[PDB]
Curated annotation (Swiss-Prot), chain B:
It comes from the Eukaryota. Present with 2600 molecules/cell in log phase SD medium. It is found in: Nucleus; Cytoplasm. Associated component of the proteasome that specifically recognizes acetylated histones and promotes ATP- and ubiquitin-independent degradation of core histones during DNA damage response. Recognizes and binds acetylated histones via its bromodomain-like (BRDL) region and activates the proteasome by opening the gated channel for substrate entry. Binds to the core proteasome via its C-terminus, which occupies the same binding sites as the proteasomal ATPases, opening the closed structure of the proteasome via an active gating mechanism. This is Proteasome activator BLM10. According to PubMed:12973301, colocalizes with nascent proteasome. According to PubMed:15778719, associates with proteasome core particles and also forms a complex with regulatory particle-core particle (RP-CP). The gene is BLM10. The chain holds residues 639 to 838 of 2143 of the full protein.
Curated annotation (Swiss-Prot), chain C:
GO terms for biological process: proteasomal ubiquitin-independent protein catabolic process; proteasome-mediated ubiquitin-dependent protein catabolic process. The 26S proteasome consists of a 20S proteasome core and two 19S regulatory subunits. The 20S proteasome core is composed of 28 subunits that are arranged in four stacked rings, resulting in a barrel-shaped structure. The two end rings are each formed by seven alpha subunits, and the two central rings are each formed by seven beta subunits. The catalytic chamber with the active sites is on the inside of the barrel. It comes from Saccharomyces cerevisiae (strain ATCC 204508 / S288c). It catalyses: Cleavage of peptide bonds with very broad specificity. This is Proteasome subunit beta type-1. InterPro entries: Ntn_hydrolases_N, Pept_T1A_subB, Proteasome_bsu_CS, Proteasome_sua/b, Proteasome_suB-type.
UniProtKB/Swiss-Prot annotation, chain F:
Keywords: Cytoplasm, Isopeptide bond, Nucleus, Proteasome, Ubl conjugation. One of its GO terms (cellular component) is cytosol. The proteasome degrades poly-ubiquitinated proteins in the cytoplasm and in the nucleus. It is essential for the regulated turnover of proteins and for the removal of misfolded proteins. The proteasome is a multicatalytic proteinase complex that is characterized by its ability to cleave peptides with Arg, Phe, Tyr, Leu, and Glu adjacent to the leaving group at neutral or slightly basic pH. It has an ATP-dependent proteolytic activity. It is found in: Cytoplasm; Nucleus. The 26S proteasome consists of a 20S proteasome core and two 19S regulatory subunits. The 20S proteasome core is composed of 28 subunits that are arranged in four stacked rings, resulting in a barrel-shaped structure. The two end rings are each formed by seven alpha subunits, and the two central rings are each formed by seven beta subunits. The catalytic chamber with the active sites is on the inside of the barrel. It comes from Saccharomyces cerevisiae (strain ATCC 204508 / S288c) (Baker's yeast). The lineage of its organism: Eukaryota, Fungi, Dikarya, Ascomycota, Saccharomycotina. Present with 17100 molecules/cell in log phase SD medium. There is a cross-link at K87, K186, K218 (Glycyl lysine isopeptide (Lys-Gly) (interchain with G-Cter in ubiquitin)). This is Proteasome subunit alpha type-3.
UniProtKB/Swiss-Prot annotation, chain G:
It comes from Saccharomyces cerevisiae (strain ATCC 204508 / S288c). GO terms for biological process: proteasomal ubiquitin-independent protein catabolic process; proteasome-mediated ubiquitin-dependent protein catabolic process. The 26S proteasome consists of a 20S proteasome core and two 19S regulatory subunits. The 20S proteasome core is composed of 28 subunits that are arranged in four stacked rings, resulting in a barrel-shaped structure. The two end rings are each formed by seven alpha subunits, and the two central rings are each formed by seven beta subunits. The catalytic chamber with the active sites is on the inside of the barrel. This is Proteasome subunit alpha type-2. The gene is PRE8. It is found in: Cytoplasm; Nucleus. The lineage of its organism: Eukaryota, Fungi, Dikarya, Ascomycota, Saccharomycotina. The proteasome degrades poly-ubiquitinated proteins in the cytoplasm and in the nucleus. It is essential for the regulated turnover of proteins and for the removal of misfolded proteins. The proteasome is a multicatalytic proteinase complex that is characterized by its ability to cleave peptides with Arg, Phe, Tyr, Leu, and Glu adjacent to the leaving group at neutral or slightly basic pH. It has an ATP-dependent proteolytic activity. Pfam families: Proteasome, Proteasome_A_N. Keywords: Cytoplasm, Isopeptide bond, Nucleus, Proteasome, Ubl conjugation.
């Protein structure tokens, strides 16, 4: 068989130029449930598929509020998102107190990139192991970002991360010119987010307990719809 | 390191099966050039290969002047085709080649001995300045002396004017405390074979 | 103390008295209040001798090191290193300093750092205890772009007065001329500046 | 296991493997240098090799100005040279401030060699792959040339050489102080001492130099400065019109 | 035994720090990025690859600005570019705060040099995964620098790094050959756009946006503005014409 | 620590049965200490060291069997505890308390297993007005024990036997001076015992009153009591 | 690991020490790493206090930074408290403690030197000590360390009596060094120091009769050659 000598920690470069410990983390993303993100010129939506343990247990929350203008969804390691979603919650709330200024989305991207990067220079600590779709309406429109644990944060119209992420990522890729023109309609942009996350399900059936949706933009502050609130989209 | 031991404990047998033998010139001139100056271990395990190939092979130009010759055009193309075949699940029994082409490949394969020794001698003088020590200094002198004995006068008389040449014009005995052994002895083994070289 | 610096056509000139007093007693009557932080960047000290000395000493360093790495220091920079020390340490210092120097681009440059730690670029600046008496003479008798000996005279008179009227000022009058052609140290004695 | 080859600890025969290797790095640039004493000057010649046509020769320097008085020339990878030069440029500014006189050549060397020693005795820090050649015209000792190495060693030379063809250059000098039987080069103007330093290097390397293949540093009393592109061509022109 | 290449501070038997050489490989396998020094400034250019159709056009900026008058562009691990440019600014603002003048290019370079070089000193921190091209305009004209993971840095007339390294370096040498006095601030921009468009054939699989910024003593009065709108199409259209 | 074993300890506990050889005998009206000196060269300066017999306070003293540079690190800190218990309670420190104070530092490494145990084993001879004369022992185990007579180091198992034989409770001090030398008849790898291979000490009922003198023997004083039989 | 450092000591230039009745002497050779180097710029025999000197065998640098750390400890831990300088016995103790800590501390290797420290304190008289990398230290009538260690140590037993005048011990330590010498043998490749009478000549001042000057004197390039002719 085939052993690896350069995958020990994060302070170690593979001969071909690769940080294996990071490539491995980037894979922890795909070890958690699927979530989807998309935006028009006036709104940004998130759809996540909360996963449960027994028939007898609650469902893991997959979307977290950050400020009244910005929120994110997670696919991957939960505690790593609790830790990052919290840091984001702070900067947002500091840009509010010191400068009385809603923290730009483009900037929380730049700030998380640098936060995750720190965990790939250091001996001892493992990299972050979760992916984040981040949404918000800042002074510059609607916005969506993809946060991989490598540090690479990228701004998009839509994407999807996790278990069978590929079903939606390919729907959105074709729907592009259609949904980014869903301005001034909120109910219709969610109808789309949900018709995309459902390409990534097998014979699987969205219910009031499976579905988690969040939205934000122009004159809608970041709100989260779990439970019965989500029924109208099924 | 494993698949270099697999291959060494089996070199002598490859020199026989009239198909594999073709590869042996290539695999050698590849080992020689891949002789590392930082990895003491990889080098000990390469010399293993290099000396085994020399112990069971005559360093000789076997071309009857047949014009098509050349290592490319005639050997390389075949070697790659055999490998492509072997790699895709297929075995060597399924591998069909003309007894004409496969003997062109084999004879043309015995041309590279000259251009490869210029690269072994180069790699020796680089090793004069390394903290490789003892066990491995010796084993390297065996490879240089075995390589000599498996040489026809055509090739040897070249190897000689190449030690002679490089021994005088060299920028290779700096570092503190050198392994002179690796270069003085291979000279003595030239004079063993050709006393005439001594007078001068 | 009692010090000033003036710019002109060819560069900048620094001037001072030489009298450090503790009380009514002149502890030293030959003080070198013109202190050097670089080839052609000098200062005028006034205030605590112990404070102005310590600072200039520490600036002489910052600039010797700046030279090592980054090269020759703008006159502007010398000033910034002074301000940074004086301002960021205001609560524990009593020093009023005049930084003056010659580069080739701007020629004559002068920065006065009052007590606060503020910094003010000017054509000429006076300071030190006995300055109060010549704000009048100077504003009336100063001109831009003076000749070398025109400026020596302007300083000799201004300082001849300050010393007449101030008890905390006196000694000899020291000058230091900073031009392209080099550093020239001046001295004028009492038998001379009093008869003016 | 076999890990006394990776950190600054003792092999079984009292050897510091990591230091011996560190030395091997000082050649990795492939520049040679030499230094000489005058009646009252000091000179350092280094080679300048600019292969990339995209480079700017003016930024390519292995000669560092450490103080008004003190010059340093490094054999070794550029990154390590600068790490050392910056630390010396600052140990010598601090020295002037704390102690009131300019920092003397041999003291700066003892202080960098002391430093170079800690690296040689602490697990976690690595020595630098550099050999620092320090020159000056120190106010007490005269022309000075002091060299420190990754080993922690320092000592003062009549003249010296460092790098790849080090011993070819060294043995040329040895045979010219066996012959004038002194500790210096009896010429007054530094110009003739620079010409001499270039001469005995051409002789020893068996190649000619152009105004672009050399870097010259010079120390007189009260100054250490480096020669410009042209200040060298003049020196070369004079060699060629007598030799 | 061996194992001389799993630890960062560690000297190979013949003077080499292997972990650094591996990082250079990560540089070589990333976006291609260049710099050109003209007669009164510098021009910078980068290749932005387009993973999918969903990446937003013009909206994932790679070129970072330092102070007001300095530009940085890097090739490789992008987050390491950011961590380096951050320490780059903390440094350029330490300098300004104390010495008033905004930090001189050569002095800025020496400061990055030491941060990087100092990341090659202990077994417990890995070198940067970027070769960084940076420069600007100071008291004495224009300066272009490049700085690899080892800490090495020099001043270039032009520079490249990235997958399309050897390719750009060669078109770059072509201009330094034809026009020794340097290009015009405006021309250098048209040409940088050519050179990126070419060094893209070494990565022609995916699609790309161009990104240019510059710092010119005549065309942006010493500051580091980006190249946008009409002047950007000016050059995108000049590349298309020298690709066909 | 596999079967309930203190490995890094036994390591050093048996490194002790190599170096040195020391003895302590408690008489009814005094105490005695004694040691053999390490492999000596002709040129080593005999009189200076006092290398294996150290004074701790005017009323306490230890014999060492172990690494010298290692015991000095201990003794230095024990001479101090002595003086802290003075400056603090204005009474001389009680022997057991000093012993425990060390034993506790020994066992400090026998557990915070991030630093290396102690060479060295101690015999302590001391007097305090709470428990007459005392004799104690200190292996790097951390344990201490009471003794009417004891030994540490090479040939330990052997002397413990002769000691058990010739000892009587009514013993005087001079009677115990002999028993100590006498039974470094056997336990001596050097055939024949000299004054220079020795170091000696006593804590008697004073050279005068009802009090307590302490006495580290000068070389000559040894060649004088060696005179009583050993060599003559 | 301490054992490997003692091994770096076992090679590296020979050095020695001899105590007498009225003085101590220590010497080593100055092996020139080149003829280009001026050997006067490096001192193998260093002053610690004006009553105490030291010589080594082994790793050059480790000696330097040990001579420095050593001078300082003489002040920081003695002179600044009691107004006197430290006694040989105790300054030696404070150096052993310094090296013994490089041993038992993590992240650092012990020093590659054995030291010979010679000196005179008012109460203990003359004495000569050896200090090993292990942090152990022993008192010597005379000994040697380094390569020539075994040859010279044997010669010293043969030639040493406890009635030596210091001039006799200088004579010996020159012969002893003549048999081991690696390079040439003169005043430029021998370093010799003594710890003898008080040298008022070398105080630098005159006016207090209670302090009389350094006992430590380092023989000049000349004084050596002079003795080697009548040798």
């Amino acid at each position: 068989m085939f052993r690896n000598n350069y995958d020990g920690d994060t302070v170690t470069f593979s001969p071909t130029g690769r940080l294996f410990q990071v490539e491995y983390a980037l894979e922890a993303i795909k070890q958690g449930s699927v979530t989807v993100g998309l935006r028009s010129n006036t709104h940004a939506v998130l759809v996540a598929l909360k996963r449960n343990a027994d028939e007898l247990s609650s469902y893991q929350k997959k979307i977290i509020k950050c400020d009244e203008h910005m929120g994110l969804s997670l696919a991957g390691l939960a505690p790593d998102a609790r830790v990052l979603s919290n840091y984001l919650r702070q900067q947002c709330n500091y840009s509010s107190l010191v400068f009385n200024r809603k923290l730009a989305v483009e900037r929380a991207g730049h700030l998380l990139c640098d936060k995750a990067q720190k965990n790939t220079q250091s001996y001892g600590g493992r990299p972050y192991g979760v992916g984040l779709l981040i949404i918000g309406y800042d002074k510059s429109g609607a916005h969506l970002l993809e946060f991989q644990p490598s540090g690479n944060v990228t701004e998009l119209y839509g994407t999807a991360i996790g278990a069978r992420s590929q079903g939606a990522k390919t729907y959105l890729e074709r729907t592009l010119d259609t949904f980014i023109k869903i301005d001034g309609n909120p109910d219709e942009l969610i109808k789309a987010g949900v018709e995309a996350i459902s390409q990534s399900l097998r014979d699987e059936s969205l219910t009031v307990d499976n579905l988690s949706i969040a939205i934000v933009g122009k004159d809608t502050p970041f709100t989260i719809y779990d439970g019965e609130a989500v029924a109208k989209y099924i | 390191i494993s698949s270099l031991k697999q291959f060494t404990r089996v070199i002598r047998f490859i020199v026989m099966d009239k198909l594999y033998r073709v590869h042996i010139t290539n695999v050698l001139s590849m080992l020689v050039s891949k002789l590392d100056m930082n990895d003491t271990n990889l080098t000990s395990n390469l010399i293993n290969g290099i000396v085994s190939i020399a112990a069971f092979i005559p360093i000789q130009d076997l071309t009857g002047e047949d014009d098509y010759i050349s290592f490319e055009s005639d050997t390389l193309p075949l070697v790659q085709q055999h490998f492509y075949h072997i790699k895709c699940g297929e075995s060597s029994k399924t591998f069909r080649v003309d007894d004409e082409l496969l003997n062109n490949a084999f004879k043309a394969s015995t041309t590279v001995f000259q251009s490869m020794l210029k690269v072994y001698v180069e790699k020796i003088f680089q090793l004069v300045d390394v903290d490789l020590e003892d066990s491995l200094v010796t084993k390297i002198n065996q490879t240089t002396m075995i390589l000599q004995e498996s040489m026809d006068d055509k090739i040897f008389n070249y190897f000689a004017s190449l030690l002679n040449r490089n021994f005088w014009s060299n920028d290779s005995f700096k570092e503190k405390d050198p392994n002179y052994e690796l270069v003085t002895i291979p000279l003595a083994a030239l004079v063993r074979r050709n006393n005439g070289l001594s007078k001068e | 103390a009692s010090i000033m610096a003036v710019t002109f056509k060819d560069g900048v000139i620094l001037g001072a008295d030489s009298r450090t007093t503790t009380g009514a007693y002149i502890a030293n009557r030959v003080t070198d209040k013109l202190t050097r932080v670089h080839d052609k960047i000098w200062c005028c000290r006034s205030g605590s001798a112990a404070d102005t000395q310590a600072i200039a000493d520490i600036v002489q360093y910052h600039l010797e090191l700046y030279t090592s790495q980054y090269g020759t220091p703008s006159t502007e920079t010398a000033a910034s290193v002074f301000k940074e020390l004086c301002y960021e340490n205001k609560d524990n210092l009593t020093a009023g300093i005049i930084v003056a120097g010659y580069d080739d681009k701007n020629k004559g440059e002068v920065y006065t750092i009052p007590l606060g730690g503020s910094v003010h670029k000017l054509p000429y600046a006076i300071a030190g205890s006995g300055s109060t008496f010549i704000y009048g003479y100077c504003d009336k008798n100063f001109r831009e772009n003076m000749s070398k000996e025109e400026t020596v005279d302007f300083i000799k008179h201004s300082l001849s007065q300050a010393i007449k009227w101030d008890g905390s000022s006196g000694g000899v009058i020291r000058m230091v001329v900073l031009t392209a052609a080099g550093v020239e140290r001046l001295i004028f004695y009492p038998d001379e500046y009093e008869q003016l | 296991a076999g890990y006394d080859r990776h950190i600054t600890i003792f092999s079984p025969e009292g050897r510091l493997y990591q230091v011996e290797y560190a030395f091997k790095a000082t050649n990795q640039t492939n520049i040679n240098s030499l230094a000489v004493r005058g009646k009252d000057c000091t000179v350092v010649i280094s080679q300048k090799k600019v292969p990339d046509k995209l480079l700017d020769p003016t930024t390519v320097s292995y000669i560092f100005c450490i103080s008004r008085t003190i010059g340093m020339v490094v054999n070794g990878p550029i990154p390590d040279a600068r790490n050392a030069a910056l630390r010396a440029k600052a140990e010598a500014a601090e020295f002037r401030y704390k102690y009131g006189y300019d920092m003397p050549c041999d003291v700066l060397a003892k202080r960098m060699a002391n430093l170079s020693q800690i690296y040689t005795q602490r697990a976690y820090m690595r020595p630098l792959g550099v050999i620092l050649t320090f020159v000056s015209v120190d106010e007490e000792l005269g022309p000075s040339i002091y060299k420190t190495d990754p080993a922690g060693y320092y000592v003062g030379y009549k003249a010296t050489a460092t790098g790849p063809k080090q011993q070819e250059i060294t043995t040329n000098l040895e045979n010219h102080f066996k012959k004038s039987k002194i500790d210096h080069i009896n010429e007054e103007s530094w110009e003739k001492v620079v010409e001499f330093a270039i001469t005995h290097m051409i002789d020893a390397l068996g190649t000619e130099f152009s105004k672009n293949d050399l870097e010259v540093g010079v120390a007189t009393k009260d100054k250490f400065f480096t020669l410009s592109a042209e200040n060298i061509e003049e020196r070369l022109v004079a060699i060629a019109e007598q030799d | 035994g061996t194992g001389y290449d799993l630890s960062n501070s560690v000297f190979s038997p013949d003077g080499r720090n292997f972990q650094v050489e591996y990082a250079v490989k990560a540089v070589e396998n990333g976006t291609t990025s260049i710099g050109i020094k003209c007669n009164d400034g510098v021009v910078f250019a980068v290749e932005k690859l387009i993973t999918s159709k969903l990446l937003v056009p013009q909206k994932n900026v790679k070129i970072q600005v330092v102070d007001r008058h300095i530009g940085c562009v890097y090739s490789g691990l992008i987050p390491d570019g950011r961590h380096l440019v951050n320490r780059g600014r903390e440094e350029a603002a330490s300098f300004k705060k104390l010495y008033k003048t905004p930090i001189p290019i050569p002095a800025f370079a020496d400061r990055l040099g030491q941060y990087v070089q100092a990341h090659t000193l202990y077994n417990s921190v890995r070198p940067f995964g970027v070769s960084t091209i940076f420069g600007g305009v100071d008291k004495n004209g224009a300066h272009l620098y490049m700085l690899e993971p080892s800490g090495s840095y020099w001043g270039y007339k032009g520079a490249a790094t990235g997958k399309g390294r050897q390719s750009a370096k060669a078109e770059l040498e072509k201009l330094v050959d034809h026009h020794p006095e340097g290009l015009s601030a405006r021309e250098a921009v048209k040409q940088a756009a050519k050179i990126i468009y070419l060094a893209h054939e070494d990565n022609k699989e995916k699609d790309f946006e161009l990104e240019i910024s510059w710092c010119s003593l005549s065309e942006t009065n010493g500051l580091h503005k980006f190249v946008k709108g009409d002047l950007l199409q000016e050059a995108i259209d000049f590349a298309q014409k020298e690709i066909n | 620590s596999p079967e309930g074993r203190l490995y890094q300890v036994e390591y050093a506990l048996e490194s002790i049965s190599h170096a040195g050889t020391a003895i302590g005998i408690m008489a009814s009206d005094g105490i005695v200490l004694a040691a053999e000196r390490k492999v000596t060269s002709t040129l080593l300066e005999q009189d200076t060291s006092t290398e294996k017999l150290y004074k701790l306070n005017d009323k306490i003293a230890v014999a060492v069997a172990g690494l010298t540079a290692d015991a000095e690190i201990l003794i230095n800190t024990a001479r101090i505890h002595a003086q802290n218990y003075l400056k603090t309670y204005n009474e001389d420190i009680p022997v057991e308390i000093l012993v425990r104070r060390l034993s506790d530092i020994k066992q400090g490494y026998t557990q915070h297993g991030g630093l290396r145990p102690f060479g060295v084993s101690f015999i302590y001879a001391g007097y305090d007005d709470r428990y007459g004369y005392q004799l104690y022992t200190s292996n790097p185990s951390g344990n201490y024990t009471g003794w009417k007579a004891i030994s540490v180091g090479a040939n330990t198992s052997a002397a413990q036997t002769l000691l058990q034989m010739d000892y009587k409770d009514d013993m005087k001090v001079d009677d115990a001076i002999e028993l100590a030398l006498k039974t470094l008849s056997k336990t001596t790898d050097s055939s024949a015992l000299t004054y220079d291979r020795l170091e000696f000490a006593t804590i008697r009922k004073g050279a005068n009153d009802g009090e307590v003198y302490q006495k580290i023997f000068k070389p000559q004083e040894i060649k004088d009591i060696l005179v009583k039989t050993g060599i003559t | 690991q301490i054992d490997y450092a003692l091994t770096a000591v076992k090679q590296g230039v020979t050095s020695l020490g001899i105590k007498a009745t009225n003085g101590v002497v220590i010497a080593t050779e100055k092996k020139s790493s080149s003829p280009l180097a001026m050997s006067e710029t490096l001192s193998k025999v260093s002053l610690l206090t004006p009553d105490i000197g030291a010589v080594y065998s082994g790793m050059g640098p480790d000696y330097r930074v040990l001579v420095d750390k050593s001078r300082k400890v003489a002040h920081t831990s003695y002179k600044r408290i009691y107004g006197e300088y430290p006694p040989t016995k105790l300054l030696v103790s404070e150096v052993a403690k310094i090296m013994q800590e490089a041993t038992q501390s993590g992240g650092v290797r012990p020093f590659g030197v054995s030291l010979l420290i010679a000196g005179h304190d008012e109460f203990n008289g003359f004495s000569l000590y050896q200090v090993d990398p292990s942090g152990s230290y022993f008192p010597w009538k005379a000994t040697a360390i380094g390569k020539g260690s075994v040859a010279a140590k044997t010669f010293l037993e043969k030639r040493w009596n406890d009635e030596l005048e210091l001039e006799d011990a200088i004579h010996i330590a020159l012969l002893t060094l003549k048999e081991s010498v690696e390079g040439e043998f003169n005043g430029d490749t021998i370093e010799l120091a003594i710890i003898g009478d008080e040298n008022p000549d070398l105080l630098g001042y005159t006016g207090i009769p209670t302090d009389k000057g350094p006992r430590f004197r380092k023989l000049t390039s000349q004084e050596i050659n002079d003795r080697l002719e009548a040798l």
